[PDB]
């Protein structure tokens, strides 16, 4: 085949070449790569085709021959430094001098087509920069190669990582995702991409939640950190192998779908693209390069392989010893590679720069002294060279400019395809109507942080660079003490705070005030009851000598009416501000008069029961003693035992005016509370026994039609007392805590009214309207 014999071609100006033709210490020997690589041979053949086409052209490099020395450099720099030293050697000599500066050199090559690997391009460019040898490198992408401080003579034909990362940042900003997670491969490519995207995100307001490095074939911690933050857009700026390991692990662990912004390394790689189960990992949005393709490169490759198979040409006429023993099928898989156009355009750029430097027309090129390599740099900047009908330019920093296409994957029958849904020519212009997202419906996956916190909220910095804040609302009873607080602070437990409030408000009292409608109604009821008591008392003291009051007590009936009036009066002291003395004296004042009236009624009941259901022998002694001074002593004993019980329960059981600061929502409370069922039960026991004795002794009796039923009134008075207080107790235990005193006064007033309307009112009816029944023979 003798293909490698074509790697040289004599000419007036000869170009260099560093291609990855081959693939893979104590002694200082250059390693030898024996494995064959198809991509390197394809790129070398592309450069040879470009050189031959330039020679064919008559309007470019007229009457001049352009050569090439395609040297094989492996991915290692040690094997690649030797071709560079050969390039810098004097023509016709094997020794490279160590001169003071570049101007004293006479290099054997006019220019160099730099290595595809950018890590190798670093060393090659830093070595060539001292000699100012114009090197234009296809495939070298990362940004720091564009620094003119250390690479004054390094150009390139592929765009830098900066433009694609700017496109990605503009895409994220335009789609609204300003809370994203950034990842990169552990190699220099990923680290440089991460730094560039950090700068761009900081400039554009985007926030990086977690910036981390996926290791080359750990990952589990990176995925855990990514998942910890609620981020739905992940920029993976990693090489093919790191991305493949990432996606395989994510398939194994079933990570939730996310919007993966793809770098050009793995956007179009079939290894990642064809991964099983990859379809469930969200959309993949990448920025593929928009460059023309050599429509005749495969034909040239086939025809040159066939022409090399012929021994006649080969005899009529190493760097790649393994390149001779190959066949066409060993390279057929890489004919449609987009770096071939980059190599072609690099060769065309060097040729056009040489044409401009010599300053000649299409007819011919004037004779002059040979042009040094460092004289090309004055014309390689600001250089417009036409490659396949498309003009290209070298920027001031040796960067070529070209457009980009935003390609998104789709899934039909597990067949992923790329569709252009955007264009980036310095300003992104997307068509998001046609984009089909991975969510349940066709909605854009939201991933946004709060740049600022709404007034009245606490702010918690979040992100790898403290970019945004997390606004958190805290429940009522708390306030933001200062804007820089990370947590809202509670206030003093005696003041209330509304939900989402900058400050708390003081807790003011709310007890049963004199103006509340319930107190107004109960005051009107008290007025009516006291008026009734006063009218009954007036009747009982005017008709005091009549048989009515004489049979129904006498002085004792008026005393009981006075006591009922005093109970109605003592009803008044329940509401209002709970002074300690008032709340302490509530109950004794309520029972003291009620005890007196109940004991008078019980005396009447006992008299009736003695006269009714006892033998006359005991009756003749009981009746003459149960009325008069002994009756007065009995009522006095009842009052005195009530007083003793009241003072004992006042000194032993404490009635306390507590301030329940945590009962009403926005207000405090002033609750006058005593022992649960103990205090009022004990104070009520004597009245309960007195009423029960009266009811038992009165409720069954013989009422002759020729007499007056003196038991119906007492029975119904006791019944009203019992039922009203039996209803009162559940109302005590159920009504809201504010209206508890109101319930108490209502119960007392209803008890007094029932006793009145049952016992005294029927007497007064016939005492005032029909005085025809007041005969002594009818009552005594």
């Amino acid at each position: 085949l003798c293909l490698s014999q074509q790697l040289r071609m004599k000419g007036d100006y000869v170009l260099g070449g560093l291609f990855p033709l081959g693939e893979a210490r104590t002694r200082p020997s250059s390693p030898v790569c024996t494995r064959f690589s198809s991509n390197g041979l394809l790129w070398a053949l592309a450069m040879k085709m470009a050189v031959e086409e330039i020679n064919n052209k008559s309007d470019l490099l007229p009457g001049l021959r352009l050569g090439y020395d395609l040297f094989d450099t492996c991915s290692e720099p040690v094997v690649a430094m030797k071709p560079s030293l050969m390039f810098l050697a004097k023509a016709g000599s094997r020794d490279i001098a160590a001169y003071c500066n570049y101007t004293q050199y006479q290099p054997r090559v006019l220019a160099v087509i730099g290595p595809h690997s950018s890590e190798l391009a670093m060393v090659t460019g830093k070595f060539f920069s001292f000699f100012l040898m114009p090197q234009v490198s296809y495939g070298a992408s990362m940004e720091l190669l564009s620094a003119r401080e250390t690479f004054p003579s390094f150009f390139r034909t592929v765009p830098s990582d900066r433009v694609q990362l700017t496109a990605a940042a503009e895409l994220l900003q335009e789609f609204g995702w300003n809370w994203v997670a950034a990842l990169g491969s552990d190699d220099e490519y990923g680290r440089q991409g991460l730094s560039i995207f950090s700068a761009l995100a900081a400039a554009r307001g985007i926030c990086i939640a977690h910036e981390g490095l996926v290791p080359l074939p750990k990952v589990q911690d990176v995925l855990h950190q990514v998942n910890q933050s609620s981020v739905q857009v992940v920029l993976l700026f990693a090489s093919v192998h790191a991305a493949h390991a990432l996606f395989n692990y994510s398939i194994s662990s079933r990570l939730s779908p996310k919007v993966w912004v793809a770098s050009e390394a793995w956007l179009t790689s079939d290894l990642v693209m064809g991964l099983p189960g990859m379809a469930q990992m969200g959309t993949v949005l990448g920025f593929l390069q928009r460059g023309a393709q050599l429509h005749e490169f495969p034909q040239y490759v086939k025809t040159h392989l066939a022409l090399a198979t012929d021994p006649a040409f080969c005899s009529a006429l190493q760097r790649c010893p393994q390149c001779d023993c190959i066949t066409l099928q060993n390279v057929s898989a890489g004919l449609n590679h987009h770096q071939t156009f980059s190599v072609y355009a690099a060769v065309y750029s060097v040729a056009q720069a040489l044409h401009n430097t010599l300053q000649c027309n299409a007819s011919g090129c004037p004779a002059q002294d040979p042009v040094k390599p460092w004289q090309l740099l004055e014309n390689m900047y600001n250089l417009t060279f036409h490659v396949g009908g498309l003009p290209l330019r070298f920027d001031s920093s040796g960067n070529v400019d070209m457009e980009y296409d935003l390609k998104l994957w789709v899934w039909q029958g597990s067949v992923p395809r790329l569709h252009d849904v955007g264009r980036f020519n310095g300003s992104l212009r997307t068509e998001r109507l046609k984009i089909r997202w991975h969510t349940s419906d066709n909605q854009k996956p939201v991933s946004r942080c709060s740049r600022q916190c709404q007034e009245g909220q606490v702010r918690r910095v979040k992100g790898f660079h403290s970019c945004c804040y997390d606004c958190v609302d805290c429940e009522a009873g708390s306030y933001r003490q200062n804007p820089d607080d990370i947590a809202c602070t509670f206030c003093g437990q005696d003041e209330w705070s509304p939900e989402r409030s900058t400050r708390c408000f003081r807790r003011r009292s709310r007890f049963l005030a004199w103006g509340e409608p319930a107190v107004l109604l109960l005051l009107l009821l008290l007025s009516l009851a006291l008026g009734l008591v006063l009218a009954a008392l007036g009747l009982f003291v005017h008709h005091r000598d009549s048989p009515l009051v004489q049979a129904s007590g006498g002085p004792l009936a008026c005393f009981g009416l006075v006591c009922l009036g005093l109970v109605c009066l003592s009803v008044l002291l329940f509401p209002g501000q709970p002074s300690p003395a008032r709340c302490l004296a509530q109950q004794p004042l309520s029972h003291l008069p009620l005890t007196g009236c109940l004991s008078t009624l019980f005396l009447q009941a006992a008299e009736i029961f003695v006269e009714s259901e006892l033998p006359l022998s005991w009756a003749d002694r009981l009746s003459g003693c149960l009325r008069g001074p002994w009756a007065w002593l009995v009522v006095l004993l009842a009052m005195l035992v009530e007083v003793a019980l009241c003072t004992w329960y006042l000194v032993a059981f404490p009635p306390e005016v507590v301030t329940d600061w945590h009962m009403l929502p926005t207000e405090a409370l002033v609750h006058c509370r005593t022992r649960s069922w103990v205090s009022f039960g004990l104070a009520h026991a004597t009245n309960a026994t007195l009423a029960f004795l009266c009811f038992l002794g009165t409720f069954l009796v013989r009422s002759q039609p020729g007499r007056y039923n003196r038991a119906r009134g007492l029975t119904f008075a006791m019944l009203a007392y019992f039922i009203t207080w039996v209803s009162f107790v559940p109302l005590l235990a159920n009504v809201q805590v504010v209206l508890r005193p109101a319930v108490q006064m209502g119960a007392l007033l209803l008890c007094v009214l029932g006793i009145l309307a049952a016992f005294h009112l029927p007497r007064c009816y016939l005492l005032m309207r029909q005085p025809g029944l007041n005969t002594p023979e009818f009552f005594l």
């Binding site: 200082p28 001098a97 660079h465 038992l696 069954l700 235990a733």
Partner: protein, 785 residues
């Protein structure tokens, strides 16, 4: 000049004499830049080392050692000196496949002082395997020998600097820091390495920021000013007070000036090796109010006889202002000691020892054989000697473990400007020998830099964000604690029905409170029930002693005897209420007490009916009365009510269950009262509802004929007893509706005993009264009236 000294074996050098701190056709030489003093210091160190090799007759005897020092710029000039070193004496470098036979001009090279130039030089030299012992280059990329076969070092890598920083943070208990890096590669790799290392030691990074690259002696743009303002504001707002800075010293003037302008104080700055020994920043003398300025730097080794030698004194091989520059900084250099100088000293001594071992000299003669650079590299890889009480030997990863040192800036010119406070030993990866550090607090307290306060004893830890070390303390709810041994992130409740108070880490067993024999209310109820039981037993004795009498024969003889025996049984099983509630206890209680009480009330009601309303009903339905009198009406009614009560109590058992219950009273969780019915309110309501449905008809029938003498005023006493029962039931219902607690059982037992006392007394005690004290009304002749 002093840059050259002819000798048998030369020793190339690369020292940064000038740096850039303010068109490609014109090449700017290193002379036009400002003069640096450290480069000349290290150059003089190497010269002194070579000169001492020449003096020492025990080391390399009869073999003069030379050198060829070339001024190498920071970045600009890094290719020409390498070509000079590898070129022959004619300045021609041959090209060949194999370089074993090649003899270079220099035998070894002391590498540049910056990592990028070291990488470039080692990349070029990898073809010839020239030994290159770099100094002060701390990048981790030089640790691997695959791409740097002939690169060695005399300084621990950034791995040990980061380890010293992490150990210093751990010793003072800092777990919330801030990382500031620079746009250069050095800052970025250092920040990434620190982030990777610090994540596994439970220390979190609040935020990482990049300071824009900004050389001094030039005015700042508006964008960079805004960037610095943003950085300082972010630094101030965060709660972290430990700020590590990975940036070259040239770009930190503006950042610190902005920090001073913004009036931000209270940060424990931690410096990398770049600016931990920078004299200009210390001479700024306004950072003393910012806080303590720690830093990581190489331990100073005092070289004897070096200060006097230093004070005694082609292209890019000349400098003129070096001496004048070093004259001003002489005192601070002398006081601070020599840190990087010893690295160059040791590198030159290592080259000398490698040459001596390669030649195989016997301290008297030397073979003077031609030495190839690769042979020298193979020899120097295996050198192990002593130098100023320090062992010099190279690790397999091209590093010799020189002791690091944590240094604190002291603003007092009377002593060392950078006072050492700690020492780090890379061999054991341990930071030890820490002295007192003058802190910036009020009373020399170690500054606190923790994001979250320690949780109070018995407080759940709730994560607040992504960072692990930051959390919030929330009290566990009542009834649970924390088992710190198992997990402190979530409360774990205590089983076995035991309750816990707030913020309590030890569950306490609830005391089982129940009716017990030796208490006050139970003894009172027992005395009352005993009085009732003896009273009813005496009534039964009287009744059996007095039969064949109108009082007991007109009244139901068997009926009253059955009711008396049932009351006796109920009184005798009254104390079964007290005691530990077991299944048998509740079974007997609910199968005996309600049955007996219900049958007694049913007997009372049917007796009242047959004595009052039967006479009236005799007028309407005569054949119904014939059926009633032919059979035994009250007995069949009692049996029907008894079987109905049996059915309802069976359904109650099948509905509410049988197992004794434990209800947590609202008064004190510590106690747990035991009743036998889990649902007691509905059961008591149902029982009282049936009993009151029977009671209302019994009492109404009794009242309808309350004046009829009948069976010795039966209607009146039935009315009295039944009204007593009604009032007692109403009192119990109201007290149940307004109270729930421990006294429910005793109140229910008291009400039951009182109801039984009513049924006994107010229905049989009158009979005993007439039988005993009224022996004239019980005669048979009184039946007519």
């Amino acid at each position: 000049s002093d840059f050259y000294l002819p000798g048998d074996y030369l020793l190339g050098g690369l020292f940064s004499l000038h740096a850039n701190m303010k068109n490609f056709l014109q090449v700017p030489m290193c002379k036009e830049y400002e003069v640096k003093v450290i480069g000349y210091n290290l150059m003089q160190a190497m010269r002194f080392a070579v000169e001492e090799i020449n003096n020492d007759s025990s080391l390399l005897p009869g073999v003069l050692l030379g050198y060829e020092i070339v001024d190498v710029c920071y970045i600009s000039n890094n290719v020409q000196p390498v070509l000079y070193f590898l070129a022959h004496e004619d300045n021609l470098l041959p090209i060949q496949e194999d370089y074993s036979n090649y003899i270079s001009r220099v035998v070894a090279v002391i590498g540049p002082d910056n990592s990028e130039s070291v990488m470039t030089v080692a990349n070029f030299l990898s073809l010839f395997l020239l030994p290159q012992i770099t100094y002060s280059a701390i990048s981790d990329e030089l640790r691997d020998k695959v791409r740097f076969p002939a690169l060695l070092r005399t300084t621990p890598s950034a791995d040990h600097h980061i380890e010293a920083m992490v150990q210093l943070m751990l010793h003072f208990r800092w777990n919330w820091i801030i990382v500031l890096v620079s746009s250069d590669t050095y800052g970025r790799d250092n920040g990434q390495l620190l982030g990777e290392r610090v994540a596994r030691r439970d220390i979190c990074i609040a935020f990482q920021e990049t300071l824009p690259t900004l050389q001094p002696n030039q005015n700042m743009t508006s964008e960079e000013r805004q960037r610095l303002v943003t950085i300082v504001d972010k630094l101030q707002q965060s709660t972290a007070r430990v700020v590590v800075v990975f940036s070259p010293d040239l770009t930190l003037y503006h950042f610190f000036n902005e920090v001073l302008r913004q009036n931000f104080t209270g940060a424990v700055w931690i410096a990398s090796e770049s600016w931990a020994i920078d004299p200009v920043l210390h001479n700024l003398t306004e950072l003393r109010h910012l806080g303590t300025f720690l830093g990581i730097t190489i331990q100073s080794v005092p070289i004897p006889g070096f200060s006097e030698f230093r004070e005694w004194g082609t292209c890019n091989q000349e400098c003129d202002n070096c001496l004048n520059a070093t004259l001003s900084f002489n005192t601070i250099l002398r006081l601070s000691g020599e840190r990087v100088v010893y690295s160059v000293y040791s590198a030159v001594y290592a080259v000398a020892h490698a040459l001596h071992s390669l030649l195989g000299c016997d301290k008297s003669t030397c073979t003077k054989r031609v030495v190839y650079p690769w042979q020298l590299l193979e020899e120097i890889w295996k050198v192990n000697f002593t130098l100023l009480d320090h062992q010099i030997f190279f690790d397999p990863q091209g590093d010799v473990a020189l002791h690091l040192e944590i240094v604190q800036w002291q603003w007092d010119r009377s002593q060392n400007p950078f006072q050492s406070v700690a020492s780090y030993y890379p061999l054991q990866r341990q930071l030890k020998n820490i002295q007192d550090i003058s802190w910036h607090t009020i009373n020399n307290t170690i500054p606190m830099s923790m994001c979250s306060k320690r949780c109070q004893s018995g407080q759940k830890k709730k994560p607040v964000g992504i960072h692990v070390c930051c959390f919030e303390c929330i009290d566990c709810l009542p009834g649970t604690f924390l088992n710190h041994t198992e997990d402190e992130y979530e409360c774990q409740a205590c089983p076995n029905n035991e309750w816990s108070y707030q913020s309590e880490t030890s569950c306490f067993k609830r005391q089982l409170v129940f009716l017990e024999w030796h208490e006050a209310p139970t003894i009172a109820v027992a005395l009352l029930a005993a009085l009732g039981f003896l009273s009813t037993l005496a009534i039964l004795v009287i009744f059996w002693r007095h039969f064949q009498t109108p009082i007991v024969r007109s009244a139901g003889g068997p009926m009253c005897f059955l009711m008396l025996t049932l009351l006796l049984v109920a009184y005798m099983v009254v104390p079964v209420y007290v005691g530990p509630p077991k299944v048998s206890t509740c079974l007997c209680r609910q199968a005996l007490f309600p049955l007996c009480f219900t049958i007694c009330i049913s007997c009372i009601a049917v007796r009242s009916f047959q004595i009052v309303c039967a006479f009236k009903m005799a007028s309407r339905f005569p054949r119904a009365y014939s059926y009633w009198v032919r059979y035994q009406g009250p007995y069949v009614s009692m049996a029907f009510i008894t079987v109905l009560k049996m059915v309802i109590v069976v359904i109650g058992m099948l509905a509410t269950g049988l197992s004794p219950t434990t209800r947590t009273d609202p008064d004190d969780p510590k106690i747990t009262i035991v009743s036998c019915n889990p649902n007691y309110r509905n059961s008591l309501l149902f029982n009282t509802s049936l009993d009151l449905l029977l009671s209302v008809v019994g009492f109404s029938f009794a009242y309808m004929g309350k004046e009829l003498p009948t069976n010795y005023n039966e209607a009146k006493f039935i009315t009295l007893s039944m009204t007593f029962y009604f009032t007692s039931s109403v009192s119990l219902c109201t007290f149940m509706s307004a109270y729930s607690g421990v006294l429910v059982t005793i109140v229910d037992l008291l009400v039951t005993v009182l109801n039984l006392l009513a049924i006994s007394l107010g229905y049989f005690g009158p009979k005993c009264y007439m039988i005993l004290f009224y022996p004239e009304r019980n005669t048979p002749a009184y039946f007519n009236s």
